[PDB]
Design a protein around this nucleic acid. Structure first.
Ligand SMILES: [K+]
Ligand SMILES: [K+]
Ligand SMILES: [K+]
Ligand SMILES: [K+]
Ligand SMILES: [K+]
Ligand SMILES: [K+]
Ligand SMILES: [Mg+2]
Ligand SMILES: [Mg+2]
Ligand SMILES: [Mg+2]
Ligand SMILES: [Mg+2]
Ligand SMILES: [Mg+2]
Ligand SMILES: [Mg+2]
Ligand SMILES: [Mg+2]
Ligand SMILES: [Mg+2]
Ligand SMILES: [Mg+2]
Ligand SMILES: [Mg+2]
Ligand SMILES: [Mg+2]
Ligand SMILES: [Mg+2]
Ligand SMILES: [Mg+2]
Ligand SMILES: [Mg+2]
Ligand SMILES: [Mg+2]
Ligand SMILES: [Mg+2]
Ligand SMILES: [Mg+2]
Ligand SMILES: [Mg+2]
Ligand SMILES: [Mg+2]
Ligand SMILES: [Mg+2]
Ligand SMILES: [Mg+2]
Ligand SMILES: [Mg+2]
Ligand SMILES: [Mg+2]
Ligand SMILES: [Mg+2]
Ligand SMILES: [Mg+2]
Ligand SMILES: [Mg+2]
Ligand SMILES: [Mg+2]
Ligand SMILES: [Mg+2]
Ligand SMILES: [Zn+2]
Lengths: 49, 116, 145, 111, 154, 101, 53
RNA sequence: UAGUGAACCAGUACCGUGAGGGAAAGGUGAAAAGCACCCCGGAAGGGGAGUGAAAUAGAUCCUGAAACCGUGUGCCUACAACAAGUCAAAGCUCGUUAAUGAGUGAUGGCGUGCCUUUUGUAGAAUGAACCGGCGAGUUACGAUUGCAUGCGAGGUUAAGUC
RNA sequence: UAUCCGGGAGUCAGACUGCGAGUGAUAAGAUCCGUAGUCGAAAGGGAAACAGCCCAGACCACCAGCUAAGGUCCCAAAAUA
RNA sequence: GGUGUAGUGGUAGGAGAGCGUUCUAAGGGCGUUGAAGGUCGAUCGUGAGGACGGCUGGAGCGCUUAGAAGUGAGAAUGCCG
């Protein structure tokens, strides 16, 4: 391969989902946590079972 | 590695401020009062881009009605006579005729008054 | 695009006359307001005042049907507390028929700079005085309209 | 070459108050302007008068213009720096004061 | 972060009373100083990955060079002393004008030194051969001894 | 003489020597085009269609294909997190009339 | 009380109309020609009604 | 406004009885060659001259945004109510990344800001004086699912050595 | 379009209108259920204005046309039918 | 790549495609005949945004592919100025 022509295979590497970077991303303004609640908090949620 | 964003923000705001020319005072100088008015301006634009057609149709119709009353007939009976006589003349055209060529409009009125 | 817009000032303005010996003021004022707006023409565009002038005659004799002569009340307020004045249309007819016809037409016009100007084109006169013989006005038949 | 400038920078008076005085002389001859600045009881009149004298003197010396026909073409008072200080007010609160400055600038033209 | 930064402790004013926002340290992220929220950390990006994939990578690279004809074998490179101009003349005789990787047996020190300083040239000693080196190079000068060493280690 | 034709789902008053702007026609530039859709013809004379005139036609010559100014459609709803933005340059074609019949 | 709203540049400048100062009474001194306030001693020559002071 | 709290005489100035807390503040020019001399002025500060490639590089020193404060000028504005725009449009003035041009705008139609939180907010519910900067789902170790690659009922090394 | 397997969620404050019942004073823009719709999360047209009513679902452009509810003397398009 | 049919309101939310910033490796190229940045333009793209010119400025910066992130601000009675 040539270093100025590199490519991966399709579907091998995916673009990260950045969160809280505008409304038109979809993951913005709440980060997929929804409206208020214990799940909508830093370190929120509950135990695992 | 660190990212500052000196130019992105400024360019993105100059765009809005260029869109905000002609606006009273703060609404062409400040990004917030402008943006809040650019979005409302676009809303109004999208809406007026529909109401424009309504308005001109209304105008044309009033003109046609006037030009028909000056021949002894009304908009509604005129247009019904036209639909009878299979005369597919737009109202824009018909208003232009009523303004400029009253004789052509009078001929159309004769056609309709015969159709009725 | 293409469709005609009457240049402000270029439309020629005619002078009309309306006798009102027996007509209702509402119907009178309706045809009159149409004229003043200039909707009687194809040149009408709604921002340039394409209308014509109106003279009104024998406004004292304007017909009021039913009890409107004694029960159609014109209210106005001085915007001072308690300053509500009422006047009947009959008294207003006998005394200031100009004001009667004016209130009718003014309510029947638009509440714009344009309509405030168009209300100036009106010229009401009780009786057949007609001081405007210099403008060569034309009689208009309300009965057909 | 038709015009001459003078400027007073870091002046210790208010721009809004100096502008009241400049509004008189803008559009005037230097004679009337100097008379007005002399018979103006205000404070900025003195500094504006010195600036105007300086402009006329520069027109004389550095340019060899004829003083007897000049007109104050431009005159304006830009804002300047602000050495800012603090008044102590009631109950330990400090209120700031902005001791403002002015960049007075006069321009005098041949006609 | 907020913890390793010199300061804090004093809540700079009361929870209440003031018309000032609620603040809990002079060195929280929203201060002119202020500990960074997450930021970078000391971090190891390296990772091993399977031997068969590695060796297939090596084979693939060398086979690509062979298919493109970008190998150049030699019998010698036995310089009496490490002069670089001799090596440059060798490259010129072999008609090389591009980048090149030079594989050498373990000990050909004079030739390694001669090839060292040149900008077009990378040098490597038959065991330190690497995918990055070879792929970066467009051509591969190699001694027959080095090729044999490659074919026995692989 | 003047005429009134039907084009682009609408109608156009027109005269000879004049250029009109209409919807995209599927023909190259500098090429002839013809409208067998005339609604009316007039001038000193006057003749009407029912709906079209009897076998009349109007000849034109393309001059240019182009695109209007970009109109921006920014749909917006307050307090509901959502906006869309579109641009749109609508294509047109310019045609200079050459004959009426 | 408190403003509740910042005034605009326009509204400022519309208050500032009558804040301008006028200067008046200037005439020329019949002796020296330079200008003086009327009913005031000429500060240059000191004369008033043709009498030194 | 980063990086040590501190690139500058910083644990300084400052606050505090004290323990203690705790800032701000970088850049002339290649080289001072840093403005001889003259003029206005009490001086400062300007204006010429002159150095310099450049002085609108002259100590507030590279660039020099915005808010903000002004000066002038093309158009409009003193019978008008208008989340201040939009659409249509007369008149006037200019002439472009030359293309269904730019600016202004009489007049008319429609139209109760942005966010948050709400069943529902134009909201007399909350936040924002404005401008600029800063400022919020990251990483380590593990688990699981999908996608991709290698190998395949065999797939793979950890630590450590070179 | 249903089912099964697996990944990821959010939602557990709902409101009104019409019909069926309760509580209520067969009062409440009341409360609680069912049922359908709309809003929420839906602009547009009418109801003067007016989330929740009537008509109707905005991908865009058009100085094109036919209709819906609602309307046609003027404001304000259409019949002084 | 084309023809036809059907569709394309949207919050929480899920999925997929991208624009832009800083840096790196490689390739290639542009800069005292004036880089970046600043500013004005009536320009192009469906959008994020991208060029080309005019003036300023005075030395570093783009373009292609791939990668790594302190990666995008309008609100936090947010902090500093
Ligand atoms: K989620
Ligand atoms: K308006
Ligand atoms: K996995
Ligand atoms: K596999
Ligand atoms: K629905
Ligand atoms: K920022
Ligand atoms: Mg990644
Ligand atoms: Mg969402
Ligand atoms: Mg937000
Ligand atoms: Mg909740
Ligand atoms: Mg929240
Ligand atoms: Mg929740
Ligand atoms: Mg809105
Ligand atoms: Mg005290
Ligand atoms: Mg601590
Ligand atoms: Mg720090
Ligand atoms: Mg009045
Ligand atoms: Mg006026
Ligand atoms: Mg309003
Ligand atoms: Mg509020
Ligand atoms: Mg507040
Ligand atoms: Mg029902
Ligand atoms: Mg209820
Ligand atoms: Mg129910
Ligand atoms: Mg909700
Ligand atoms: Mg609706
Ligand atoms: Mg709402
Ligand atoms: Mg119809
Ligand atoms: Mg009507
Ligand atoms: Mg959809
Ligand atoms: Mg749809
Ligand atoms: Mg850079
Ligand atoms: Mg960040
Ligand atoms: Mg801010
Ligand atoms: Zn005297």
């Amino acid at each position: 391969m040539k270093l100025h022509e590199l490519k991966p295979a399709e579907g091998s590497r995916q673009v990260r989902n950045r969160v809280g970077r505008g409304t038109s991303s979809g993951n913005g303004k709440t980060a997929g946590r929804g409206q208020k609640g214990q799940k909508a908090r830093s370190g929120g949620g509950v135990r695992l079972g | 590695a660190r990212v500052k964003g000196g130019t992105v923000t400024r360019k993105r705001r100059k765009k809005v401020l260029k869109l905000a020319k002609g606006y009273y005072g703060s609404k062409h100088t400040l990004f917030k009062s402008a943006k809040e008015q650019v979005m409302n301006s676009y809303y109004y634009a999208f809406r007026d881009r529909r109401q424009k057609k309504r308005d001109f149709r209304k105008l044309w119709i009033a003109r046609i009605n006037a030009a028909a009353r000056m021949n002894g007939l009304s908009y509604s009976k005129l247009m019904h006579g036209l639909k009878l006589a299979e005369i597919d003349i737009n109202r824009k055209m018909l208003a232009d005729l009523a303004v400029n060529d009253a004789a052509a409009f009078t001929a159309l009125a004769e056609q309709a008054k015969d159709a009725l | 695009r293409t469709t005609y817009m009457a240049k402000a000032g270029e439309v020629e303005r005619k002078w009309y006359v309306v006798d009102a010996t027996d007509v209702p003021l509402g119907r009178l004022s309706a045809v009159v307001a149409s004229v003043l707006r200039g909707k009687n023409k194809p040149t009408f565009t709604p921002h340039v005042d394409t209308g014509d002038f109106v003279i009104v005659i024998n406004a004292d004799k304007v017909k009021l049907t039913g009890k409107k002569a004694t029960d159609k009340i014109y209210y106005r307020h001085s915007m001072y507390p308690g300053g509500l004045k009422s006047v009947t249309a009959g008294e207003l007819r006998d005394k200031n028929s100009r004001r009667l016809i004016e209130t009718s037409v003014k309510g029947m016009l638009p509440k714009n700079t344009l309509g405030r100007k168009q209300f100036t084109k009106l010229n009401v006169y009780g009786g057949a005085e007609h001081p405007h013989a210099a403008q060569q006005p034309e009689v208009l038949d309300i009965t057909n309209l | 070459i038709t015009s001459a400038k003078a400027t007073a920078k870091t002046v210790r008076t208010s721009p809004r108050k100096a502008r009241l005085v400049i509004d008189l002389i803008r559009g005037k001859s230097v004679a009337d302007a100097i008379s007005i600045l002399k018979f103006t009881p205000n404070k900025s009149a003195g500094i504006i008068e010195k600036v105007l004298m300086s402009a006329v003197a520069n027109a004389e010396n550095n340019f060899d213009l004829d003083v007897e026909s000049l007109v104050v073409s431009e005159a304006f008072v830009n804002e300047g720096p602000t050495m800012k200080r603090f008044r102590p007010r009631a109950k330990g609160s400090a209120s700031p004061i902005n001791k403002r400055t002015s960049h007075i600038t006069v321009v005098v033209t041949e006609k | 972060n907020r913890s390793a930064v010199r300061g804090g402790g004093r809540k700079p004013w009361r929870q209440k009373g003031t018309g000032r926002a609620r603040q809990g340290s002079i060195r929280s992220p929203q201060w002119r100083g202020g500990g960074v929220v997450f930021g970078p950390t000391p971090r190891s990006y390296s990772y091993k990955f399977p031997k068969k994939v590695r060796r297939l990578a090596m084979k693939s690279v060398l086979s690509d060079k062979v298919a493109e004809n970008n190998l150049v074998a030699v019998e010698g490179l036995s310089f009496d002393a490490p002069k670089t101009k001799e090596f440059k003349q060798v490259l010129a005789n072999l008609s090389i004008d591009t980048k090149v990787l030079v594989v050498l047996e373990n000990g050909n020190d004079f030739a390694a030194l001669s090839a060292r300083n040149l900008p077009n040239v990378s040098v490597v000693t038959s065991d330190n051969v690497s995918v990055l080196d070879v792929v970066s190079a467009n051509k591969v000068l190699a001694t027959q001894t080095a090729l044999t060493q490659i074919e026995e280690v692989l | 003489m003047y005429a009134i034709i039907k084009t682009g789902g609408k109608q156009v008053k027109v005269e000879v020597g004049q250029a009109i702007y209409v919807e995209k026609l599927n023909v190259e530039a500098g090429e002839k085009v013809v409208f067998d859709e005339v609604i009316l013809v007039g001038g000193e004379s006057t003749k009407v269609g029912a709906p079209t005139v009897a076998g009349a036609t109007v000849e034109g010559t393309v001059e240019k294909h182009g695109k209007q100014k970009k109109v921006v459609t920014f749909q917006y709803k307050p307090k509901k997190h959502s906006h869309r933005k579109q641009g749109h340059r609508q294509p047109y074609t310019k045609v200079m009339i050459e004959a009426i019949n | 009380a408190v403003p509740a709203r910042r005034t605009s540049k326009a509204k400022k400048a519309k208050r500032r109309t009558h804040y301008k100062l006028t200067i008046k009474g200037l005439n020329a001194c019949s002796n020296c020609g330079e200008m003086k306030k009327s009913h005031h001693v000429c500060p240059a020559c000191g004369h008033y009604d043709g009498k030194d002071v």
